[PDB]
Amino acid sequence: GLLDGKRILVSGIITDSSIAFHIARVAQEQGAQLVLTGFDRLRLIQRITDRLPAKAPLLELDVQNEEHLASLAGRVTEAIGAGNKLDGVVHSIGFMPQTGMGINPFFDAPYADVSKGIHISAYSYASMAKALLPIMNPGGSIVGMDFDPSRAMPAYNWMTVAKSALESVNRFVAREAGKYGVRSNLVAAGPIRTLAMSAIVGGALGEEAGAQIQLLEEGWDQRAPIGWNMKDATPVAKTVCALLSDWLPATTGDIIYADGGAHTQLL
Template structure:
């Protein structure tokens, strides 16, 4: 295959079904020539089956972005498939049921989980892959329009607004860096 992404190596996180944005991102990236590595969480047998539906079956690894051990080994596990990354797609979101539908009633532990998975994880993921990023690499986070308070979206909307803010701060911190080794020095 050849195209816009020929020779590029991408990590696409958050694949769970073939109707997910992450799956379609991986599919289109492959159609444009990229080598894709996928992550999923939880139902890994399902994620592995979904990966076989891509134009080229992609390697899959488990990634719980709240698990420090999994984040600490992520670069090593990715290196089994690619020496470097040209891009990372953060397509991860979760909020416990209590965070949907009754904004005032959601308990802090559930809100905290939502913020950790949806927003803080972009920072965690960026730090985990920094040693692998090429100088021109990009990290993309998928969000939702957080300019308004959507009915029933509640704490997920807050988490997505936080994700947008994390993105701005990562751009400020990592944007001026000239290389992955500079990023590693800045973050560690």
């Protein structure tokens, strides 16, 4: 398998539609031994991770919690065993309150909400790198999840702002990670219709919000020379696994686009 013998920490599983759920699934299919981290609802997360091909210890991690971060390395060390290290780290954590993305006007998002969004979505990529680099093997790899923020797009609002910050954090994390022989990269994925986005499409935020996501999806599939299936996270999961492998050994501080080539085309 592509990741045979590799010890990989994977964060961000909340539902079986989570991009992380599919990263974990494909990583296990490729012979990786995983350590999973979950936020808040750990009983629910355990029930979700029970749906994976194989068993994996599950650790609690709230990236806004300093105690969880200060203890993370020792907790990982305990789960994988003394004398062992992590070969890979997957950051698949993203959040922005409704006030910062959706139908709320861009100017009406309060800074508390935007700052919480940027803490979890951008700053936490450096926090996790800081906590895990000392327990990472040389040749190691850290992958974060990006959504192309190069051009402004309706609805995404402050989440697009958080992704621009994340892109910058990634290049600085690469400088630190390099000292440990570790690579740091982001995967910029096309839109994925998780349980949450399926509710917006249905109308949880009103008919205007639904139509906004319906138009994005259509446009993305049209633009992509190989097409784009919003319901399938496998292509994105495989790209993350490719960055976790030894098959992109000279790529760091960079962004790999798993978007069907949509960002390279105007129409």
